Design a protein around this ligand. Sequence first.
Ligand code: GSH
Ligand code: CO
Length: 277
Amino acid sequence: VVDWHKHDSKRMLHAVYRVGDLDRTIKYYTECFGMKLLRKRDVPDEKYTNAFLGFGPENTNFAVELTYNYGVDKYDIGTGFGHFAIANDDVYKLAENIKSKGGKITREPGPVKGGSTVIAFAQDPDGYMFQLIQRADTPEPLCQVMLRVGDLERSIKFYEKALGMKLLRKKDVPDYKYTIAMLGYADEDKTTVLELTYNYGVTEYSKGNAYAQVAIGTNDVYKSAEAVDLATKELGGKILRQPGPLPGINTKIASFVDPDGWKVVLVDNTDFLKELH
Ligand SMILES: N[C@@H](CCC(=O)N[C@@H](CS)C(=O)NCC(=O)O)C(=O)O
Ligand SMILES: [Co+2]
């Protein structure tokens, strides 16, 4: 009866991570990457400011949630965090826009080494990598969060059983000693996937203190947390916050780490809508 996965309607909501200079990142994402600034919220009582950016409204699209901590101008990215990706129908056009705007292209546009898909890489002001992926027409340009993991097979099993993700793609690249998987809730080219990368013989990475978590919406945080609890008893990872409403707000969430220590927050799909204004 973990056929709850089949009855839920989960959705990748946003990646949350920290930035040294909020205005600098906003300007880089709007001007270099063509994102929209969706919402900005200042929180003096707790000493931070958030900004939310993406390619459509947060009720239908995935977003980045940026956290600026007062008087903190840098973070450790760590070695485990891979990249965010942006799909675009002309990666040459986009890369040259980024260069024009004074952005950093670290990997010029061209087919992936060993494959055919045209990709490029940009580096943002804090050091976060953005892959650019040539793709004809997606409803979701902000289309990957890539994380490194120590055991690809353990992680695939974990995301399937804990989160109801489908394994969309698994690809071994022995010439370059890595293997990838993409997991998510719809066809890869229509959605935001989680891309997990294993490098041969590498079992550990630093989580840093820059990337915080990914948030995933669910029709019921209690049912979905039960599935997480079962998966963690078998496969590794740990519940952080048990399912329930947050103090005062009544917004229902649960949170956990995966077998490698990456954090995921489950948020009630309807409660999530309560801040999107
Ligand atoms: N060691 C790499 C392995 C993954 C990898 O190389 N992925 C491809 C895309 S699937 C890439 O970045 N290739 C570099 C290129 O084509 O220049 C990592 O951990 O990031
Ligand atoms: Co990627």
